[PDB]
Design a protein around this ligand. Sequence first.
Ligand SMILES: [Mg+2]
Ligand SMILES: [Mg+2]
Ligand SMILES: [Mg+2]
Ligand SMILES: [Mg+2]
Ligand SMILES: [Mg+2]
Ligand SMILES: [Mg+2]
Ligand SMILES: [Mg+2]
Ligand SMILES: [Mg+2]
Ligand SMILES: [Mg+2]
Ligand SMILES: [Mg+2]
Ligand SMILES: [Mg+2]
Ligand SMILES: [Mg+2]
Ligand SMILES: [Mg+2]
Ligand SMILES: [Mg+2]
Ligand SMILES: [Mg+2]
Ligand SMILES: [Mg+2]
Ligand SMILES: [Mg+2]
Ligand SMILES: [Mg+2]
Ligand SMILES: [Mg+2]
Ligand SMILES: [Mg+2]
Ligand SMILES: [Mg+2]
Ligand SMILES: [Mg+2]
Ligand SMILES: [Mg+2]
Ligand SMILES: [Mg+2]
Ligand SMILES: [Mg+2]
Ligand SMILES: [Mg+2]
Ligand SMILES: [Mg+2]
Ligand SMILES: [Mg+2]
Ligand SMILES: [Mg+2]
Ligand SMILES: [Mg+2]
Ligand SMILES: [Mg+2]
Ligand SMILES: [Mg+2]
Ligand SMILES: [Mg+2]
Ligand SMILES: [Mg+2]
Ligand SMILES: [Mg+2]
Ligand SMILES: [Mg+2]
Ligand SMILES: [Mg+2]
Ligand SMILES: [Mg+2]
Ligand SMILES: [Mg+2]
Ligand SMILES: [Mg+2]
Ligand SMILES: [Mg+2]
Ligand SMILES: [Mg+2]
Ligand SMILES: [Mg+2]
Ligand SMILES: [Mg+2]
Ligand SMILES: [Mg+2]
Ligand SMILES: [Mg+2]
Ligand SMILES: [Mg+2]
Ligand SMILES: [Mg+2]
Ligand SMILES: [Mg+2]
Ligand SMILES: [Mg+2]
Ligand SMILES: [Mg+2]
Ligand SMILES: [Mg+2]
Ligand SMILES: [Mg+2]
Lengths: 205, 262, 151
Amino acid sequence: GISRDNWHKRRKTGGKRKPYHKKRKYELGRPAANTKIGPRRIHTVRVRGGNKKYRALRLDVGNFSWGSECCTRKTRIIDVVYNASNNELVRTKTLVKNCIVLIDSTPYRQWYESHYALPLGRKKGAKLTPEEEEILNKKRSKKIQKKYDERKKNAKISSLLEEQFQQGKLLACIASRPGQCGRADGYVLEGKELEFYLRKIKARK
Amino acid sequence: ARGPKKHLKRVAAPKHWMLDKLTGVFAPRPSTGPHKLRECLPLIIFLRNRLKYALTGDEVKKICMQRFIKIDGKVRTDITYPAGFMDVISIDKTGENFRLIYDTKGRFAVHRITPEEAKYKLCKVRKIFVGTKGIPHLVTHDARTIRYPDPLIKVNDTIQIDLETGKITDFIKFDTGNLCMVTGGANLGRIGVITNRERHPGSFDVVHVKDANGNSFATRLSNIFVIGKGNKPWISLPRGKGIRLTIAEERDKRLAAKQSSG
Amino acid sequence: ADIQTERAYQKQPTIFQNKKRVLLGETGKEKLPRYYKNIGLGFKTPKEAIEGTYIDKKCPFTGNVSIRGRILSGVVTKMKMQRTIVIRRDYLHYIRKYNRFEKRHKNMSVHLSPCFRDVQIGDIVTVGECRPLSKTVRFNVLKVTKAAGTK
RNA sequence: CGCUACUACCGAUUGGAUGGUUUAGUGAGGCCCUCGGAUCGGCCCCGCCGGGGUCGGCCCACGGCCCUGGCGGAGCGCUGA
RNA sequence: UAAAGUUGCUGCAGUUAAAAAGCUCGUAGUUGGAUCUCUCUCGGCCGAAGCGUUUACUUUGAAAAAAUUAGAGUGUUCAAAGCAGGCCCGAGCCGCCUGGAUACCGCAGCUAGGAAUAAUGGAAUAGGACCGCGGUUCUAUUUUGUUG
RNA sequence: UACCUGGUUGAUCCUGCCAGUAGCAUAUGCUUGUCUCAAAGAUUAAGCCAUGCAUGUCUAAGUACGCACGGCCGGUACAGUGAAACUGCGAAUGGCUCAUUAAAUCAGUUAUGGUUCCUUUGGUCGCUCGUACUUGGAUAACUGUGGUAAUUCUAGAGCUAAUACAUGCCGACGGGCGCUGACCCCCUUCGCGGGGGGGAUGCGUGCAUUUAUCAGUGGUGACUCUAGAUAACCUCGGGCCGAUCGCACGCCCCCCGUGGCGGCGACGACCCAUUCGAACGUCUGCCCUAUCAACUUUCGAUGGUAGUCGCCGUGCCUACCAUGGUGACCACGGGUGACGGGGAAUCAGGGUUCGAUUCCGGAGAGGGAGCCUGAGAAACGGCUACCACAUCCAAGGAAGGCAGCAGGCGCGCAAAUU
Ligand SMILES: [Mg+2]
Ligand SMILES: [Mg+2]
Ligand SMILES: [Mg+2]
Ligand SMILES: [Mg+2]
Ligand SMILES: [Mg+2]
Ligand SMILES: [Mg+2]
Ligand SMILES: [Mg+2]
Ligand SMILES: [Mg+2]
Ligand SMILES: [Mg+2]
Ligand SMILES: [Mg+2]
Ligand SMILES: [Mg+2]
Ligand SMILES: [Mg+2]
Ligand SMILES: [Mg+2]
Ligand SMILES: [Mg+2]
Ligand SMILES: [Mg+2]
Ligand SMILES: [Mg+2]
Ligand SMILES: [Mg+2]
Ligand SMILES: [Mg+2]
Ligand SMILES: [Mg+2]
Ligand SMILES: [Mg+2]
Ligand SMILES: [Mg+2]
Ligand SMILES: [Mg+2]
Ligand SMILES: [Mg+2]
Ligand SMILES: [Mg+2]
Ligand SMILES: [Mg+2]
Ligand SMILES: [Mg+2]
Ligand SMILES: [Mg+2]
Ligand SMILES: [Mg+2]
Ligand SMILES: [Mg+2]
Ligand SMILES: [Mg+2]
Ligand SMILES: [Mg+2]
Ligand SMILES: [Mg+2]
Ligand SMILES: [Mg+2]
Ligand SMILES: [Mg+2]
Ligand SMILES: [Mg+2]
Ligand SMILES: [Mg+2]
Ligand SMILES: [Mg+2]
Ligand SMILES: [Mg+2]
Ligand SMILES: [Mg+2]
Ligand SMILES: [Mg+2]
Ligand SMILES: [Mg+2]
Ligand SMILES: [Mg+2]
Ligand SMILES: [Mg+2]
Ligand SMILES: [Mg+2]
Ligand SMILES: [Mg+2]
Ligand SMILES: [Mg+2]
Ligand SMILES: [Mg+2]
Ligand SMILES: [Mg+2]
Ligand SMILES: [Mg+2]
Ligand SMILES: [Mg+2]
Ligand SMILES: [Mg+2]
Ligand SMILES: [Mg+2]
Ligand SMILES: [Mg+2]
């Protein structure tokens, strides 16, 4: 079937070589796992040695990490925006390694508001719900307020991430291979890399 | 081939088994075990060819299935079990104990030992690594893994193992001036004192050894097994103390023995 | 800017450059810590690798490669591919019947790291063996020594 | 130059021939993906046979609440293969 | 296959027996004139580290499947073979002694001495060696009994 | 044993061949008394095959209600031998042949710090804080009813097992550690304030899996190594954390029980190490041919970046890019009555020729191609098609692969017993 051998290739000098054996089992290849966005669907593959490969065919959630805050959370995947290898992968919404996707921001916002006790992602209109009010304006003692006020010294986020939180969606990069392990894991883009990919996305439009 | 091979041609067998050519087409292929195929001695070869207890391969099986043979204190019924260097073979029916030690010709010898000596063996440290929960592990030349070894024990050292409990009693460090035996190459079976070690980064190290008579030779670091500290071995040695004679003096000794015979 | 020339972001995988810090430490300098390593066997790390800013995953000093095997030497003959050159190794082959020799040569395509600059055609190069980096490349440039005509 | 024979060469022309390549047009069969759902179960709704407890009017009769073994019929109800 | 010094590297021929291009230039290839008599530091005289401007060469050493060839031993009745065998018995009713060597294994790749021969290298616009002395910039460890 | 002889002329000295001479290995002719070894359908046809055999397996230790045999009690589960069948393992080794194959195979030398690995050997296997005195539904063998000309074809009905197929607890289990932390104390302060402790209630927790961050037990010439810490994840086509078997049977209690404890083994299992390997790489090395001098790059040729696929490294493949890569030191193409070596014949010293053939690697099973199972096969005494042959048939269908051992036809100068 699909063979990934080296003896069907031309030589370095440019001359072609005559094979000396037929296709072997250990040189096989398999059709690509074009992973889309949707309700989870994963198929297992029996591979050499009796081991398993998880062939993800459909995925909708994955755990991503906010590196600067060291906050890893499980969030749903919304859309695919950029792909360095090919732009056809963006049009068909295929999940591969190193592709740029949009993920939800709610769990990160919850952790930020529960840790620093500061608003984040809220509109200037200041509309509020009592649960959020008691999360932010809870009655704490002197010692606990002393820790929270000290934490408020380091509570500062760049304008790009703040605007993304206002929009409700964050930009992330997938670091795992969905077609091999069956899961889509990655990290939240920030810093110079975020500016680079924002410039690339804007130039693509 | 499409998989593992299960036979061994008699002419392709190791030459230190001293098999003859006309007995058959095949030789006993050693089973997988603590020792390599080319560096072991199958139980059948030792039981019928060396000791002359059995005449055929069927009698070796009849002896083994009575659970008479013990290797390192454990009963082995496999007749192709790979027995290797510094192994102890016990036969309680006849009350005999043997230790597999190379002679100066590079062949395993029938070396009888005291039953007191049959309680321990020497092993060469092959690997040191830290496992889960920060627990040190030591791996010897005969596939033994020991947990919590002494922190001073490193690779290329020698440890004394008590066969009943399988625990380290003491050890010998790899230093110049210690006693060693060669376990491979052209100098296989020789005994001497380490003189110096040559280090070649990215390649094999070379160790120089000098015997009791003053003859010097060299081997690779992987072919050296530390036997004793200084000049005193920690095990009993065979008839030849590890000194290799030249052909001329072997002839002289043979002629002297013949003249005094009769 | 000059480093970012591909469609994908070029980064050193083992360096985390998004560590947040106070506003006082941001003003000082935006100087990424460089990742480099000693390759062993007595070879020294070029100062351009430690102080440089290039990104090369196949560099022996700042990339993910391992040098093990044979250490060979050659003369640079062609520099026309991207980060890889062609060197020539000359030798003599002995013919037993005539008790004489004949001149022979081999060509090697080897990887050249950006840390080595001012490399000209005709200077001596010491290369080390690594895993196959491409179809025809199995060696990496470790040292460069200039020709006899250096002024 | 005239007799007698052989081998090797050209070259009207097209046959018996096979073998090896490829341009285009079809293309068996396996494998992968997206569908498909013959059929086989389990869970709910009733009914009558049967065994454990307890509750009620209570005296060897009959219902309530749970379980428990089988049997018959529905629901394009649910679910699994 | 030898004979064939009738394929000639050893080791053939080219005036007249078969044979030197009509002549010259010239790239690659081959070949190329003489000459030149271990080291500081750090650790316990040696140990670490740099060696060697580097090779070629030669002499060592290591790693190098058996079988075959060469070769040691051994009355298969001799031999071609084989790897066997030998000794005393009053019987050892615990039988005893002994072999299954060694050499060779091209080229390429490892290792350590040699320094003749043959290649290659340095200081000439001196931004060349060796011993010192001032000026400036950038970062790491330790000492001020700890901590800023 | 470092060797020569006849032949051109009327005669001579040469050049130069022809012929003579001795091995070796194929055939053939004549002849042949005794003994020890011993090659043997390679060359032409990797042409075609009648028939028979060449791969099967049970211990005390997975499953016996077959009287098929068998000893005692007679409900008093199962005495023992044990056909058949389910389950497990092997069938990827061995044997044959040399068609393909010219930096390919192969040999020496290195590497996997770039992978997988049945089995053996050793190490782990209360490390997880959340019906169990043993859970569920079926299927053979067996008993009965059948279909087809025909096969190692199978259909329906009635029973019954597991180390087959599934599902699932208790115990260790007292706690410990990370975060959240209402509240309660102890110092200094006139007081705010500055400190030091204790803490109920909640979430998480072990080894493997995926991703991100932090610090720097043991090792290498060199890790992005090993180990440690933190935040999460953990696939229903689902990682581990024992519902299995045999033999001897005993010590203990406020006890006669739900009685508690205990020794050797067998089987199984996640993960390390080891053994047997396999698979990709490094350097050097191969016969003739120029009446083969330029080749490769549309359809990957050389390199870069990111991915896919793969057990892993890589134009292995994809997208976007650069214009590269090889060659008189013979590239590219063609031929080979070319499998490569260990080796064989002849040989003064050099050398020439051979190596299908019992050992080590490779390849193939009429030619191609595609797969299932499995640790391992692109397997052919496994399956599925096409191409070429070819067997039985009741014309509807069914079944094929001797380059395994004998044996047969054909081929030939050329090769053995069903
Ligand atoms: Mg082939
Ligand atoms: Mg085979
Ligand atoms: Mg065996
Ligand atoms: Mg010569
Ligand atoms: Mg199809
Ligand atoms: Mg000749
Ligand atoms: Mg001669
Ligand atoms: Mg001469
Ligand atoms: Mg002549
Ligand atoms: Mg002439
Ligand atoms: Mg002239
Ligand atoms: Mg010239
Ligand atoms: Mg000269
Ligand atoms: Mg060899
Ligand atoms: Mg040999
Ligand atoms: Mg005459
Ligand atoms: Mg002749
Ligand atoms: Mg007679
Ligand atoms: Mg034939
Ligand atoms: Mg043939
Ligand atoms: Mg034959
Ligand atoms: Mg057979
Ligand atoms: Mg079976
Ligand atoms: Mg199998
Ligand atoms: Mg046979
Ligand atoms: Mg090789
Ligand atoms: Mg790998
Ligand atoms: Mg294993
Ligand atoms: Mg039935
Ligand atoms: Mg099971
Ligand atoms: Mg780690
Ligand atoms: Mg890549
Ligand atoms: Mg690439
Ligand atoms: Mg051929
Ligand atoms: Mg040949
Ligand atoms: Mg000779
Ligand atoms: Mg001669
Ligand atoms: Mg041969
Ligand atoms: Mg051959
Ligand atoms: Mg042939
Ligand atoms: Mg073979
Ligand atoms: Mg095959
Ligand atoms: Mg065949
Ligand atoms: Mg055939
Ligand atoms: Mg076929
Ligand atoms: Mg299997
Ligand atoms: Mg096949
Ligand atoms: Mg067959
Ligand atoms: Mg077969
Ligand atoms: Mg036959
Ligand atoms: Mg047959
Ligand atoms: Mg014949
Ligand atoms: Mg015949």
